Amino acid sequence: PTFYRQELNKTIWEVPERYQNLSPVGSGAYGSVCAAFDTKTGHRVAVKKLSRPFQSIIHAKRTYRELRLLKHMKHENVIGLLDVFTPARSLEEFNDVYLVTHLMGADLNNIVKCQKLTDDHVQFLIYQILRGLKYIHSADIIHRDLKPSNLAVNEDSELKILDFGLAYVATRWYRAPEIMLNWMHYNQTVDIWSVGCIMAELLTGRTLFPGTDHIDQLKLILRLVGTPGAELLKKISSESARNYIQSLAQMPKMNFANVFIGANPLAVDLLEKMLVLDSDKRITAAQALAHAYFAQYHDPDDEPVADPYDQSFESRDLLIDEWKSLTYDEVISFVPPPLDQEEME
Ligand SMILES: Nc1nccc(-c2c(-c3ccc(F)cc3)ncn2C2CCNCC2)n1
Ligand SMILES: NS(=O)(=O)c1ccc(N2C(=O)CCC2=O)nc1
Ligand SMILES: N[C@@]12C[C@H]3C[C@@H](C1)C[C@](O)(C3)C2
Ligand SMILES: [Ca+2]
Ligand SMILES: [Ca+2]
Ligand SMILES: [Ca+2]
Ligand SMILES: [Ca+2]
Incomplete structure (x- = not known):
C-alpha cells in the first residue's frame, strides 16, 4: 500500500492511502487519535498513533501490552481492532505503531x-x-x-x-x-x-x-x-x-x-x-x-465471556529490542475481522 504523510497534532503521521480525511479527535493512552474515512469499506474509523512506542523499556512493554490486549478484545461494548499498521518495511525500520477501531464520536x-x-x-x-x-x-x-x-x-x-x-x-x-x-x-x-x-x-x-x-x-x-x-x-x-x-x-x-x-x-x-x-x-x-x-x-x-488470555508476559523483563520484535510480530500476524460479525438472534 502507498502511504502518505500529513502533519496532525504538530507531528507527521504516515498512513496508508486507504485511510483518508484524518482530523484530530483527542489524545488517548500513550498516543493521539484522529478520525478517518476507511475507503475500503466506507466506514468511519479512529486511528491512534502511539507516542514514542519504543523510547524505553516502559514504553516498549506498554506498546506490546496494548497491542496484545486490543487484538484479544472481541466484544461489542469493548474497544477492539479493525486494523494495525506501520510504515516500516522491516523490523529494522520499525518505530511507529498505529491502531484502528470503529469511530466513536x-x-x-x-x-x-x-x-x-x-x-x-x-x-x-x-x-x-x-x-x-x-x-x-x-x-x-x-x-x-x-x-x-x-x-x-x-x-x-x-x-x-x-x-x-x-x-x-x-x-x-x-x-x-x-x-x-x-x-x-x-x-x-x-x-x-x-x-x-x-x-x-x-x-x-x-x-x-x-x-x-x-x-x-x-x-x-x-x-x-x-x-x-x-x-x-x-x-x-x-x-x-x-x-x-x-x-x-x-x-x-x-x-x-x-x-x-x-x-x-x-x-x-x-x-x-x-x-x-x-x-x-x-x-x-x-x-x-x-x-x-x-x-x-x-x-x-x-452477554458473552472472553477466550482465555495469556498474560504471562507481564512478569517478564525483556530488552527493548525484544519487546519491539514481539510487537512487530503482533503487527504482522494481525488478521482483520470480518466487516459483519453478527447475526440475528
Ligand atoms: N473517537 C474515537 N473513537 C474510537 C476510539 C477513540 C479513542 C482511542 C482509540 C483506541 C484504540 C484505537 F485502535 C483507536 C482509537 N483512544 C482514545 N480515544 C478517544 C476516547 C474518547 N476521548 C477522545 C479519545 N476515539
Ligand atoms: N444531589 S441532588 O439532591 O441535587 C439530586 C438531584 C437529582 C436527583 N434525582 C432526580 O431528580 C431523579 C433521580 C435522582 O437521583 N436526586 C438528587
Ligand atoms: N454527593 C454526596 C452524596 C452523599 C450525600 C451528600 C452528597 C454527601 C456525600 O458525602 C454523600 C456526597
Ligand atoms: Ca449481520
Ligand atoms: Ca450495528
Ligand atoms: Ca437480544
Ligand atoms: Ca436468543
Missing part, C-alpha cells in the same frame, strides 16, 4: 440528551458498561480507572470501554477506594465501584464524590456508606492511614433512597449493591446484568 460526559437522561436510557448506558466489564473480567483483565472519559459513545448511545488493562492530572472521583488509597488487595469489583459512581451521576446530574484530595474524597465516601469496621483496616498497610480512619467520628450508612430522590427504586437497589466499601461484598458485573433494573435489556445469549 463522544465520551460519556458528552452523551447526547434532551435536557435530562430518562431512566430507560440510563439503564441502557449502564447495561452496556456492565456487559463489557463481564467480558474483560472473564479474561482476568481489570480496568482500574473506569470513568466517563474512558467510555466511548457514538451518536446512538452505543458504548465501548477503553483504556482498560493499562498502566497529566487524572480525576480520581470514580476510582475504587482500594485503588485511590493503595490498599493491599483488591479484585475485579474495583470497576463496579466506578460503575456505581458513574450511574449515580447519570441519575442526579452531580458528581457523587467530588473530593478535593484523597482525604476529602474518603470523607465524602464514608458519609454515604458509613464508617467501616475493623475488618477493613486489615487491607491498609499504613499505620497512620489506619489510625486516621479509626479516629474518625462514627457515621451511619445513609438510606440511598434519601440520596437519589425520585429515582427508580430498582436503580437505588442496584446502587446499594455496587457502592459497598467491602470489595468482597460488591456485586460482580455478571450478577449486576441479572438485576431487575436491566430487565428490558438483559439477554443471557448476548
Whole structure:
C-alpha cells in the first residue's frame, strides 16, 4: 500500500492511502487519535498513533501490552481492532505503531440528551458498561480507572470501554477506594465501584464524590456508606492511614433512597449493591446484568465471556529490542475481522 504523510497534532503521521480525511479527535493512552474515512469499506474509523512506542523499556512493554490486549478484545461494548499498521518495511525500520477501531464520536460526559437522561436510557448506558466489564473480567483483565472519559459513545448511545488493562492530572472521583488509597488487595469489583459512581451521576446530574484530595474524597465516601469496621483496616498497610480512619467520628450508612430522590427504586437497589466499601461484598458485573433494573435489556445469549488470555508476559523483563520484535510480530500476524460479525438472534 502507498502511504502518505500529513502533519496532525504538530507531528507527521504516515498512513496508508486507504485511510483518508484524518482530523484530530483527542489524545488517548500513550498516543493521539484522529478520525478517518476507511475507503475500503466506507466506514468511519479512529486511528491512534502511539507516542514514542519504543523510547524505553516502559514504553516498549506498554506498546506490546496494548497491542496484545486490543487484538484479544472481541466484544461489542469493548474497544477492539479493525486494523494495525506501520510504515516500516522491516523490523529494522520499525518505530511507529498505529491502531484502528470503529469511530466513536463522544465520551460519556458528552452523551447526547434532551435536557435530562430518562431512566430507560440510563439503564441502557449502564447495561452496556456492565456487559463489557463481564467480558474483560472473564479474561482476568481489570480496568482500574473506569470513568466517563474512558467510555466511548457514538451518536446512538452505543458504548465501548477503553483504556482498560493499562498502566497529566487524572480525576480520581470514580476510582475504587482500594485503588485511590493503595490498599493491599483488591479484585475485579474495583470497576463496579466506578460503575456505581458513574450511574449515580447519570441519575442526579452531580458528581457523587467530588473530593478535593484523597482525604476529602474518603470523607465524602464514608458519609454515604458509613464508617467501616475493623475488618477493613486489615487491607491498609499504613499505620497512620489506619489510625486516621479509626479516629474518625462514627457515621451511619445513609438510606440511598434519601440520596437519589425520585429515582427508580430498582436503580437505588442496584446502587446499594455496587457502592459497598467491602470489595468482597460488591456485586460482580455478571450478577449486576441479572438485576431487575436491566430487565428490558438483559439477554443471557448476548452477554458473552472472553477466550482465555495469556498474560504471562507481564512478569517478564525483556530488552527493548525484544519487546519491539514481539510487537512487530503482533503487527504482522494481525488478521482483520470480518466487516459483519453478527447475526440475528
Ligand atoms: N473517537 C474515537 N473513537 C474510537 C476510539 C477513540 C479513542 C482511542 C482509540 C483506541 C484504540 C484505537 F485502535 C483507536 C482509537 N483512544 C482514545 N480515544 C478517544 C476516547 C474518547 N476521548 C477522545 C479519545 N476515539
Ligand atoms: N444531589 S441532588 O439532591 O441535587 C439530586 C438531584 C437529582 C436527583 N434525582 C432526580 O431528580 C431523579 C433521580 C435522582 O437521583 N436526586 C438528587
Ligand atoms: N454527593 C454526596 C452524596 C452523599 C450525600 C451528600 C452528597 C454527601 C456525600 O458525602 C454523600 C456526597
Ligand atoms: Ca437480544
Ligand atoms: Ca449481520
Ligand atoms: Ca450495528
Ligand atoms: Ca436468543
